[PDB]
Design a protein around this nucleic acid. Sequence first.
DNA 1: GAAGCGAGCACGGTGTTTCGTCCTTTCCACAAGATATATAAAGCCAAGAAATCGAAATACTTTCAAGTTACGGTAAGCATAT
Length: 98
Amino acid sequence: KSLDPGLKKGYWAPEEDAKLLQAVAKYGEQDWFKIREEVPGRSDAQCRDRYLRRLHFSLKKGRWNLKEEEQLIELIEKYGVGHWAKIASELPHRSGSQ
DNA sequence: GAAGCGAGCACGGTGTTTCGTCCTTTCCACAAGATATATAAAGCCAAGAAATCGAAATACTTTCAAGTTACGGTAAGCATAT
């Protein structure tokens, strides 16, 4: 993921919306090593988290309404603090990064 | 005619070869060696087949090199809010 002349450190999505989203239907959620051979400028390490955080569906998003605080409470009430504790390993997709 | 000058032939030598034993064999022969055979107990020598153990080959364990999935935490420049 570094010192590579073929990688691109860009920020926007030039051609990515196709080059990376084709893997959605082309290949499953495993063996990312196969896709990196066709998409230039993109590495597997960043590709995994990009694919994950861009196409996910079930996430607590929207405006902070009068009913979201109970959601947060029952979230931190599942197993513990969650954000960094080891319980983060079983919280489904609620990693500390977010 | 017999005394002074040139005269055969028996004889006496080595050296070389021949002849004829004595040599040790090859070969042969009369008398007597195991040579067959009967034990039989003993322990050891010694040339064949069957069971056993050492070496190791190909095989599978196991352990040690590579490495890429999956995973958890911080930092910058564009967008957007009062």
